Amino acid sequence: AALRQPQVAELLAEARRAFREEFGAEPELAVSAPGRVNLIGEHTDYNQGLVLPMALELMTVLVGSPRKDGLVSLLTTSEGADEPQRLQFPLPTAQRSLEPGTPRWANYVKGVIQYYPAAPLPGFSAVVVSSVPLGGGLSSSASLEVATYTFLQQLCPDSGTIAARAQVCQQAEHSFAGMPCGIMDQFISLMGQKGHALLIDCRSLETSLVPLSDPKLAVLITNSNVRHSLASSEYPVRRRQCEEVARALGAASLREVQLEELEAARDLVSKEGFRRARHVVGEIRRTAQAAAALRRGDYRAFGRLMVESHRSLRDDYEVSCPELDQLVEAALAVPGVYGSRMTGGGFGGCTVTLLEASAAPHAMRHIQEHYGGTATFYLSQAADGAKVLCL
Amino acid sequence: AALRQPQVAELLAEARRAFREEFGAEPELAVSAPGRVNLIGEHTDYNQGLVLPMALELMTVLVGSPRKDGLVSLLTTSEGADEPQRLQFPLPTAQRSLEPGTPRWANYVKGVIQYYPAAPLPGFSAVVVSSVPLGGGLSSSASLEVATYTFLQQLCPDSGTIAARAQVCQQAEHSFAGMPCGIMDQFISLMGQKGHALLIDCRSLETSLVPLSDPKLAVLITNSNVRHSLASSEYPVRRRQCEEVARALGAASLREVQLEELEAARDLVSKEGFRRARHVVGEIRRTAQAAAALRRGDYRAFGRLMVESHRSLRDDYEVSCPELDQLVEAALAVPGVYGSRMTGGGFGGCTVTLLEASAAPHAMRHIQEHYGGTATFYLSQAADGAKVLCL
Numbered sequence: 001a002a003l004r005q006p007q008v009a010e011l012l013a014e015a016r017r018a019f020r021e022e023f024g025a026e027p028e029l030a031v032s033a034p035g036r037v038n039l040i041g042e043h044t045d046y047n048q049g050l051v052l053p054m055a056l057e058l059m060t061v062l063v064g065s066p067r068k069d070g071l072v073s074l075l076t077t078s079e080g081a082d083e084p085q086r087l088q089f090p091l092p093t094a095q096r097s098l099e100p101g102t103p104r105w106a107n108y109v110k111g112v113i114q115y116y117p118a119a120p121l122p123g124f125s126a127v128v129v130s131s132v133p134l135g136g137g138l139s140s141s142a143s144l145e146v147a148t149y150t151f152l153q154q155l156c157p158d159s160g161t162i163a164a165r166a167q168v169c170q171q172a173e174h175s176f177a178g179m180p181c182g183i184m185d186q187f188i189s190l191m192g193q194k195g196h197a198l199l200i201d202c203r204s205l206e207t208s209l210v211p212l213s214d215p216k217l218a219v220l221i222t223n224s225n226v227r228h229s230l231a232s233s234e235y236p237v238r239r240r241q242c243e244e245v246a247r248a249l250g251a252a253s254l255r256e257v258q259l260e261e262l263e264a265a266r267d268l269v270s271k272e273g274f275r276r277a278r279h280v281v282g283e284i285r286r287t288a289q290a291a292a293a294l295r296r297g298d299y300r301a302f303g304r305l306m307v308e309s310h311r312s313l314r315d316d317y318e319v320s321c322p323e324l325d326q327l328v329e330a331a332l333a334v335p336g337v338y339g340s341r342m343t344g345g346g347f348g349g350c351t352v353t354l355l356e357a358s359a360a361p362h363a364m365r366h367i368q369e370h371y372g373g374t375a376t377f378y379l380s381q382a383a384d385g386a387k388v389l390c391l
Numbered sequence: 392a393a394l395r396q397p398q399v400a401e402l403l404a405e406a407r408r409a410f411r412e413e414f415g416a417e418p419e420l421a422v423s424a425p426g427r428v429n430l431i432g433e434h435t436d437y438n439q440g441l442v443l444p445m446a447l448e449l450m451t452v453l454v455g456s457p458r459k460d461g462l463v464s465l466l467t468t469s470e471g472a473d474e475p476q477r478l479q480f481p482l483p484t485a486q487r488s489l490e491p492g493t494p495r496w497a498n499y500v501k502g503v504i505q506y507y508p509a510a511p512l513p514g515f516s517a518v519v520v521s522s523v524p525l526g527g528g529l530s531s532s533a534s535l536e537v538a539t540y541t542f543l544q545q546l547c548p549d550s551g552t553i554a555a556r557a558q559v560c561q562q563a564e565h566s567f568a569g570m571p572c573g574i575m576d577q578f579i580s581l582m583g584q585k586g587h588a589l590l591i592d593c594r595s596l597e598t599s600l601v602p603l604s605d606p607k608l609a610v611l612i613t614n615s616n617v618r619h620s621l622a623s624s625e626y627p628v629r630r631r632q633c634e635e636v637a638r639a640l641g642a643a644s645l646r647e648v649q650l651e652e653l654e655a656a657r658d659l660v661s662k663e664g665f666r667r668a669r670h671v672v673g674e675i676r677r678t679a680q681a682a683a684a685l686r687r688g689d690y691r692a693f694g695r696l697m698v699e700s701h702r703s704l705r706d707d708y709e710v711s712c713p714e715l716d717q718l719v720e721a722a723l724a725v726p727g728v729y730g731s732r733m734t735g736g737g738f739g740g741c742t743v744t745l746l747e748a749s750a751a752p753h754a755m756r757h758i759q760e761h762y763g764g765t766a767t768f769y770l771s772q773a774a775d776g777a778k779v780l781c782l
């Protein structure tokens with residue numbers, strides 16, 4: 001059975017209750033920002049590549065009020081954050097910028113405040129609630145960042161585009177969480193549309209909505225509930241390796257490189273560098289092709305490209321893990337599935353399976369049996385992106 | 392001088408004031424929906440073609456409150472609107488539906504109510520204010536429809552998609568306003584992102600957000616301050632003319648006819664229908680070429696394609712008028728101007744001019760000095776789509 005995904009009104013109700021308790025009054029302001037699953041296009045965003053994510057009904061809700069004292073007071077209800085669940089700190093000033101510290105979870109919020117481009121920002125009181133599993137590879141980090149950004153807009157309206165907001169949150173993750181992420185997770189949290197995946201061009205920042213308007217078609221997310229300790233360990237190593245292959249080929253990014261230049265420049269780069277870069281040029285072509293397939297309603301072919309994505313991620317990019325491999329195989333055994341693959345950064349988190357809606361019950365029953373650990377499941381539809389909730 | 396474009400704060404404050412005077416208390420809810428300019432792709436939307444509009448900073452703001460008495464009570468502050476500017480009527484029920492009546496401006500709101508897809512809808516009191524000029528060709532009609540729709544979502548949440556909202560608003564315009572528009576104006580008012588043009592495929596309802604972030608580039612809008620009612624007359628004539636050329640060629644729409652295939656099929660259709668179809672099929676091709684020029688920052692190429700769109704609308708489609716053609720040829724004589732063309736329906740309304748930012752002041756002097764009438768100007772950036780405003 002799939003996990004019940006609580007609606008915005010339920011999270012917003014728990015957020016109001018926890019806030020009213022903590023601060024002594026009803027909060028004035030509220031926002032939501034969703035998590036995400038990448039259908040295909042993994043380890044391409046920081047290579048100026050193509051990705052095809054959708055926003056989930058799994059989301060972070062922030063409620064709060066402005067203060068007059070220039071302090072920030074936070075409570076997260078998520079049990080997976082490092083303690084304390086409470087933190088206060090002063091707004092950054094001309095005299096003193098914020099610095100990352102403990103607890104680590106608040107570094108995400110500190111970073112978005114630090115880089116928020118509009119002034120004057122007042123202090124505020126806020127509670128965070130989330131149905132996005134922390135560390136699940138469904139972007140709880142981006143969801144928290146974009147909820148924070150969208151809350152700050154309610155206190156002090158910004159002047160810029162949705163791309164700039166995504167880049168503020170990305171910068172927060174780089175400087176304050178030490179995670180050199182690409183733009184995808186922030187961009188989909190902001191830009192998601194109900195009943196659509198987004199083809200995102202991480203070079204141009206052009207976005208194409210592709211309809212997911214088909215009740216025969218189900219996206220199943222399977223959480224391995226494994227988080228191996230290569231996560232924010234081997235991810236920065238892959239990004240730097242890609243960037244060295246590009247510079248040693250004289251390209252601004254691997255987006256500017258094709259498999260034929262790469263094969264011809266094999267002696268200019270490490271054996272490992274070649275393999276990383278082979279995944280990325282392949283993956284960019286696969287996600288352009290997969291987008292076109294999805295538009296024409298050719299699920300068979302989209303599934304094929306998904307399974308080629310998994311193989312490439314597992315062997316050439318080495319960011320899968322026995323648990324994710326086992327889920328992907330178990331899912332491909334089930335009559336009615338088009339494809340299955342790891343989604344997110346890897347070394348744990350979730351798989352994304354595309355299949356016939358009528359197969360979902362069997363798919364779940366099968367996968368859980370044929371999995372060593374304990375999988376949770378989500379039947380997900382493409383959700384809206386970040387919005388204001390008027391209290 | 393460009394005409395001042397009021398900010399959302401100034402429009403909220405006017406709407407609340409008018410709402411306090413009329414209904415005796417502060418409104419509970421607020422929304423906004425923008426007008427639009429079409430950069431290229433005219434009279435293609437209802438031919439299942441391509442369009443490239445952007446949302447304007449000109450907008451409609453609805454503020455209101457739910458009622459318990461199943462009544463709708465409305466006031467517009469637009470002095471352009473036909474008398475009376477205030478109106479009360481019951482919601483439709485099982486037995487009885489709303490019908491188009493008088494005043495005509497209220498039919499846009501009656502229409503969105505009648506075809507609003509979710510229940511139950513309470514009665515409501517609302518004030519509308521607008522900075523979109525009524526009848527000026529920047530789609531005050533779609534702006535009013537989308538702001539009404541977005542307001543109805545606050546009373547009674549809907550569960551369909553962004554495209555289904557555009558269709559409800561299009562249907563209201565067809566049945567209640569008697570104007571068989573395509574989907575462009577409703578779609579951009581819903582889907583507009585600040586700093587972006589929207590490439591809409593009106594066959595697949597696929598959309599691409601294309602960035603417009605060269606601040607040396609500007610979009611000048613010149614209102615002719617003319618409108619002939621050769622327009623409400625000839626729009627539906629052009630539409631059926633297009634439908635009978637497709638039928639006569641065995642195609643579902645002119646989107647299925649390539650330009651060279653149409654040139655070789657001259658003998659299948661009237662020499663009038665032929666020229667109508669040549670505009671359309673060629674405008675669809677020009678829009679894909681214009682999108683591609685935008686993506687590589689070729690404003691010269693974009694500009695020349697706008698001028699071909701204009702010459703085509705003037706000669707082949709015959710929906711320009713002397714005022715629009717004087718405005719265009721005056722703009723093209725200004726150094727720094729890339730292109731100029733009539734935008735929207737025709738027979739009046741505005742031109743759109745792509746020029747160097749630093750040339751705009753000279754262009755406004757030249758165009759006015761060389762125009763037989765009284766031009767008004769707007770220097771508009773790509774703006775946001777419809778949204779909720781929290782009071």
Ligand SMILES: Nc1ncnc2c1ncn2[C@@H]1O[C@H](COP(=O)(O)OP(=O)(O)O)[C@@H](O)[C@H]1O
Nearest residue numbers: 076078081105130134135136137138139140141
């Ligand atoms: N709602 C939340 N409350 C507290 N901390 C959160 C919340 N959402 C995310 N986090 C923080 O972000 C971290 C997860 O980010 P990351 O390791 O990139 O995984 P993912 O984004 O894939 O879930 C958590 O360990 C925690 O620090």
Ligand SMILES: Nc1ncnc2c1ncn2[C@@H]1O[C@H](COP(=O)(O)OP(=O)(O)O)[C@@H](O)[C@H]1O
Nearest residue numbers: 467469472496521526527528529530531532535
């Ligand atoms: N804010 C408004 N208040 C009242 N009526 C409005 C408003 N905005 C639009 N309308 C209605 O829409 C009509 C104009 O639409 P139309 O003739 O299609 O021109 P356009 O959409 O190009 O401005 C007005 O005459 C009026 O009936």
Ligand SMILES: OC[C@H]1O[C@H](O)[C@H](O)[C@@H](O)[C@H]1O
Nearest residue numbers: 042043181182183184344345
């Ligand atoms: O595709 C891999 C994926 O991994 C993590 O989710 C990062 O946050 C994204 O930017 C992206 O790099």
Ligand SMILES: OC[C@H]1O[C@H](O)[C@H](O)[C@@H](O)[C@H]1O
Nearest residue numbers: 433434572573574575735736
């Ligand atoms: O492109 C011409 C244009 O004309 C009018 O604005 C209609 O409202 C739109 O649907 C479109 O057909």
Ligand SMILES: [Mg+2]
Nearest residue numbers: 139140141142
């Ligand atoms: Mg993350």
Ligand SMILES: [Mg+2]
Nearest residue numbers: 530531532533
């Ligand atoms: Mg109109």
Ligand code: NA
Nearest residue numbers: 368371372373
């Ligand atoms: Na199991």
Ligand code: NA
Nearest residue numbers: 759762764765
């Ligand atoms: Na004049």
